[PDB]
Amino acid sequence: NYSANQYEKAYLPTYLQNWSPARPTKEKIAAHEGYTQIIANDRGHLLPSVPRSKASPWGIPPAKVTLTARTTTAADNLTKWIHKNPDLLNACNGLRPEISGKPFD
Amino acid sequence: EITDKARHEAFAAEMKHNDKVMCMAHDREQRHRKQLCRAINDFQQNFQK
Amino acid sequence: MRECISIHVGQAGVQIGNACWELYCLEHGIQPDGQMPSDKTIGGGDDSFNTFFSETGAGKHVPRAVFVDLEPTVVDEVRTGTYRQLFHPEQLITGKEDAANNYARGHYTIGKEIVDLVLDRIRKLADLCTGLQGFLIFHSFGGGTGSGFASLLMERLSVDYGKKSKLEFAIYPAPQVSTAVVEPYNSILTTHTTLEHSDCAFMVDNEAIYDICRRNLDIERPTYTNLNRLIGQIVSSITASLRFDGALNVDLTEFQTNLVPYPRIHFPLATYAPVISAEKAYHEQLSVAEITNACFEPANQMVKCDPRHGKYMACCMLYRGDVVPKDVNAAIATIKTKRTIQFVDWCPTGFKVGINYQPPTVVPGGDLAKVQRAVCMLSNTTAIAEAWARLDHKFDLMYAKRAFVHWYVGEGMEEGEFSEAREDLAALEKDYEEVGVD
Amino acid sequence: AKVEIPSPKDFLKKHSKEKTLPPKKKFNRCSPKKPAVPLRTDH
Amino acid sequence: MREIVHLQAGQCGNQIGAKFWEVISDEHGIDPTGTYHGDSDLQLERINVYYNEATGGKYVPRAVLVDLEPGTMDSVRSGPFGQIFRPDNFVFGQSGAGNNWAKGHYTEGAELVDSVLDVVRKEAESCDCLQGFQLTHSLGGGTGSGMGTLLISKIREEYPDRIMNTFSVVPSPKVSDTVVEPYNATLSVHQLVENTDETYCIDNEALYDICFRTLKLTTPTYGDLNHLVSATMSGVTTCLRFPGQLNADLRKLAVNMVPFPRLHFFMPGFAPLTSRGSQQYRALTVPELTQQMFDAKNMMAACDPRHGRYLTVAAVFRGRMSMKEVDEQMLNVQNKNSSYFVEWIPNNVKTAVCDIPPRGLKMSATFIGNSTAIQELFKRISEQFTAMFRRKAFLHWYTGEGMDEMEFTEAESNMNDLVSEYQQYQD
Amino acid sequence: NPVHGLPFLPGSSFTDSTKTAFHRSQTLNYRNGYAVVRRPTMGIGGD
Amino acid sequence: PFLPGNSFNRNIGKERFHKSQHWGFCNNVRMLVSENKPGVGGDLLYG
Numbered sequence A: 001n002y003s004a005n006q007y008e009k010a011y012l013p014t015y016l017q018n019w020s021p022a023r024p025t026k027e028k029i030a031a032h033e034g035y036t037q038i039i040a041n042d043r044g045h046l047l048p049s050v051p052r053s054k055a056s057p058w059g060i061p062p063a064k065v066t067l068t069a070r071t072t073t074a075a076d077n078l079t080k081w082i083h084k085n086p087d088l089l090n091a092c093n094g095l096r097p098e099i100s101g102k103p104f105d
Numbered sequence B: 001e002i003t004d005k006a007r008h009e010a011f012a013a014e015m016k017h018n019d020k021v022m023c024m025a026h027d028r029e030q031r032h033r034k035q036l037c038r039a040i041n042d043f044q045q046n047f048q049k
Numbered sequence C: 001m002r003e004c005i006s007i008h009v010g011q012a013g014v015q016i017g018n019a020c021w022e023l024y025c026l027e028h029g030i031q032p033d034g035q036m037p038s039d040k041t042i043g044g045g046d047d048s049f050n051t052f053f054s055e056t057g058a059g060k061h062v063p064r065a066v067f068v069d070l071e072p073t074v075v076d077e078v079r080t081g082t083y084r085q086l087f088h089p090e091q092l093i094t095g096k097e098d099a100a101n102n103y104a105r106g107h108y109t110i111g112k113e114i115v116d117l118v119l120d121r122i123r124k125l126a127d128l129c130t131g132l133q134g135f136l137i138f139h140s141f142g143g144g145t146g147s148g149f150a151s152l153l154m155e156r157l158s159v160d161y162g163k164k165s166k167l168e169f170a171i172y173p174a175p176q177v178s179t180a181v182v183e184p185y186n187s188i189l190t191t192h193t194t195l196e197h198s199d200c201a202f203m204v205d206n207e208a209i210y211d212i213c214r215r216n217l218d219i220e221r222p223t224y225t226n227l228n229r230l231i232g233q234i235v236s237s238i239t240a241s242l243r244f245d246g247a248l249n250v251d252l253t254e255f256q257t258n259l260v261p262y263p264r265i266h267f268p269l270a271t272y273a274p275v276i277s278a279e280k281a282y283h284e285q286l287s288v289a290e291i292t293n294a295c296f297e298p299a300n301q302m303v304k305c306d307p308r309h310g311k312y313m314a315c316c317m318l319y320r321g322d323v324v325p326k327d328v329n330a331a332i333a334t335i336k337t338k339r340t341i342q343f344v345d346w347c348p349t350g351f352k353v354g355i356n357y358q359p360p361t362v363v364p365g366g367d368l369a370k371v372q373r374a375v376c377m378l379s380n381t382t383a384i385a386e387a388w389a390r391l392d393h394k395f396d397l398m399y400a401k402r403a404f405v406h407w408y409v410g411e412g413m414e415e416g417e418f419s420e421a422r423e424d425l426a427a428l429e430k431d432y433e434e435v436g437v438d
Numbered sequence D: 001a002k003v004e005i006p007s008p009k010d011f012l013k014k015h016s017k018e019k020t021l022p023p024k025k026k027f028n029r030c031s032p033k034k035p036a037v038p039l040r041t042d043h
Numbered sequence E: 001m002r003e004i005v006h007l008q009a010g011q012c013g014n015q016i017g018a019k020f021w022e023v024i025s026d027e028h029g030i031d032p033t034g035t036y037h038g039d040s041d042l043q044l045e046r047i048n049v050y051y052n053e054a055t056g057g058k059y060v061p062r063a064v065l066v067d068l069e070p071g072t073m074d075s076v077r078s079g080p081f082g083q084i085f086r087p088d089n090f091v092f093g094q095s096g097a098g099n100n101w102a103k104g105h106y107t108e109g110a111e112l113v114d115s116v117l118d119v120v121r122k123e124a125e126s127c128d129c130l131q132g133f134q135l136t137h138s139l140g141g142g143t144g145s146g147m148g149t150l151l152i153s154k155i156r157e158e159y160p161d162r163i164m165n166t167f168s169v170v171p172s173p174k175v176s177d178t179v180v181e182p183y184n185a186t187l188s189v190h191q192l193v194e195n196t197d198e199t200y201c202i203d204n205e206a207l208y209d210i211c212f213r214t215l216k217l218t219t220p221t222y223g224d225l226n227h228l229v230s231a232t233m234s235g236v237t238t239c240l241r242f243p244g245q246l247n248a249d250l251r252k253l254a255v256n257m258v259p260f261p262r263l264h265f266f267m268p269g270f271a272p273l274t275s276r277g278s279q280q281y282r283a284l285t286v287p288e289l290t291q292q293m294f295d296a297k298n299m300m301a302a303c304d305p306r307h308g309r310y311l312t313v314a315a316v317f318r319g320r321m322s323m324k325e326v327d328e329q330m331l332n333v334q335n336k337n338s339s340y341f342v343e344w345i346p347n348n349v350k351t352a353v354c355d356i357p358p359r360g361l362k363m364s365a366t367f368i369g370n371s372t373a374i375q376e377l378f379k380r381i382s383e384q385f386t387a388m389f390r391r392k393a394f395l396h397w398y399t400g401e402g403m404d405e406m407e408f409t410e411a412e413s414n415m416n417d418l419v420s421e422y423q424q425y426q427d
Numbered sequence F: 001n002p003v004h005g006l007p008f009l010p011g012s013s014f015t016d017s018t019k020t021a022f023h024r025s026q027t028l029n030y031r032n033g034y035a036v037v038r039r040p041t042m043g044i045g046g047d
Numbered sequence G: 001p002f003l004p005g006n007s008f009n010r011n012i013g014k015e016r017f018h019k020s021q022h023w024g025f026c027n028n029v030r031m032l033v034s035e036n037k038p039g040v041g042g043d044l045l046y047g
Ligand SMILES: Nc1nc2c(ncn2[C@@H]2O[C@H](COP(=O)(O)OP(=O)(O)OP(=O)(O)O)[C@@H](O)[C@H]2O)c(=O)[nH]1
Pocket: C009, C010, C011, C012, C013, C015, C016, C071, C098, C099, C100, C101, C139, C140, C142, C143, C144, C145, C146, C147, C171, C179, C180, C224
């Protein structure tokens, strides 16, 4: 799930025809120390002491737009008319669009 | 000139060697691809009948 | 590479797409079977058809379009037509239940269960394609099945896929002809839903299509084939840049960037100048100047808008055939000098020239003339607000006496949504003069 | 290495990025050992 | 030795190079296959200033082709001279430009600048000691403006000691087709003036009038327009490739042509243009060449310097001449219009003579002009830019790209400064 | 028998209009992790 | 010749591929089973 080195032109949506970015990647790791203890028994069972992703994931008005120049009051709703929907802001391919614009005077 | 010539024929003989087999190689794979493609298409409709 | 996908929603959108694809197979010399003669053009699907067809090692030119429908009636005989062998069987999306002219019925009752399937068709088309610049959406505002079903799909394709273009094509409602009085209900519903998502919406009206033909094509008795012939020529002309090169090549990306001035309003108007009968073409001469006069003649537009009642912002001309830069630049210079033509003082230049060597072809058993120099006129003017102005007084009376709502509230809406569209429109009209004001 | 992609933040300001300098080149010259050819009209 | 490597960019740069390179191939006399047919020793000797040597007497051009849209390159590669062009040097992208400066200057250039610099540097150690670089593109060309500003900004830091020659064409004043073109030009020239050391200024409308005036052939090909200009920068490079009592160094030219740093923009001037019957109706003599050479109708670059005055002039003469005629003609023009020059500098003329005539004609020449006639050019764009920025038309595209109006503020500010600089020096 | 390979002067050239169809061949494609370029065989219209 | 890039594998019509076991174990030691063995898809051995 990492980005490779140097030859970073052979793996892009250029061939994927991907229209929702795949996954953010990086090339950097802090120098890890640690005897990397084992904290389960036989089943992925975390020993009660150690923490996990504590059941975080377990398992339309949103659209791309720039505010540009459309009446402030209409634009203000649009921002709210974009957000306040975590059913489309959290997970499951990403569900998350972008935004831009500029204010008025 | 012996130094000069020796380079010239060493290239050209190698040069003519390269392209022609490349030309022949590219032709060969296409035809066999074509022959395989038609061969697949023939019995299948015969099998479809 | 350079390709795009066509979609045909509404039972009206399927016969027109049929003719378009019927037109498209001629210039490539496609036999109805699906194969070329013994001549060598087949492969992995890469030739003039690669942008349009998918002729893989199987040798069958597979068009890159999906025809979606909700009634088995009109979608079956085409599946028994002449080129049904060409068409991918499960690309021809059929249904068993109609939307009954109801946007929401198609948009809610049946839309959920079928969009997932067509989304599967979209993705399995998406994976096979390579560059896929945009989509070709063929629909209709008074969509009996077009209205509701197009909206939901263009929502779903927008939200998952937002980084490309989406090209929209619908018949505009006839200003004084209405084959349905619930047509204003969904039409404004479609418009307000599409303004914030649609990239480029292009309209057309059948009345003036008829009005043209008995004017100069001289056929007092055309047919839908004739109607579909003209519009199919229009989309053929705009895609000739993809099909053929010229002095310069232009793309839909340029069309989007250069045509729309500002957000919301993205509704230019098409036009094709050399509309004439074969006999009138026979003993007359065509040159750039007169067709440049003809293209801007007010009676040659398929949309009932007096251009003098409005003002121009953009004008795109796409010369397909044997032309040279000299006369056209001189001719357009004279056009700039004209006074009756009134672009906004805001735009110094609003002209996007397209040059294509290829003379457009006639169709066997057709009705058009034989043209050497053609031009397509996609343009946007302020004379269009009257149409929506026509719609609102039509709609404002109707909603006050709220006819037919018993059906709409009867299957699961309320009046708030109908409220939104009116101030949505009231925004569009009020914006139209504000930008119309210099 | 990886080449930075100049982000749309800024660029040259009013073209102050230049080298104009009007100095004076001092140190004079070498010594012209040849003296004044005449002696200013005297004896 | 001192050599030159070319840069071709923008889709016009695609067409001009092919025409530019075919002229050179023909004027040195190499077959389309690439095997040089030895006929002139001098073209045989001084080929290494622009071309390298491949195996079999094949003269590999030293140029780099960059674009985004494959179709233009496919047409170029399918031309009669694409074979002499290297698949190594065919660098391009996977995107359509949109004819947009912002994406071409920031977005798509990101993944191509690395590749293109690698190609040019590989050529750089391939050759020994360059004079510099020359670039054919357009200021109104969207992709050419985008990549050029990127690379010309770069090659300055690696090579601030060379010649960064820029060949750009000004779009038509009456109409630019592209409507965001005034924005693209204003941006590009702003970085251009900071990066370039030389700029050729050419406009297409004059070539249309030149076709009307001396060509008289009604309907030409745009390649013929390329053919007309392909001789131009060839003529200035004839100085380098050909002998004769003339100092050919563009530096020695530029220092003679650059009194002050900000003077980057220069106007070409070409020699006999002749019509159907006047080829045999013309007594080909230096005066009538000199008369025709300094004709306001013979001008092709931007507009008539009649509106302003003459800062500096340099005409290079190609053919069999003598010092006696060029001197008196210089006196003739000097006394002809002594007041039309600027009193700031007398003897503002620098002459070079090439003893080697071109193929086909004996008497020829070329001219580069720096007069006070560019004000109309960027003043014209001033009303356009001030117009379009008064309500920021089509601005939402660039904001999504990351662009914002503050950059435009100094963009117009400098060109305003240039107007006064051009104004103050003469007026 | 016109003068072939005549002076290719910048001003004038010849013309022809017998050309009817202009199709160009795709010699560029991407097709897997490496962009791959074809050898040009057919010109405009196919020749 | 056989230089890198010059190896063009026999990737033509190949319908039979059956493999044999040239070697084996037998009793309690290990050796090659009876020499007469076809190759991949019935291929003859060296001489
Ligand atoms: N573009 C186009 N429009 C047509 C054609 N025929 C009729 N129309 C108009 O386009 C509209 C199509 O909308 P609908 O009638 O709802 O068609 P539909 O949604 O596909 O399905 P139905 O409700 O069964 O008709 C009709 O109201 C007609 O006025 C045609 O052949 N082409």
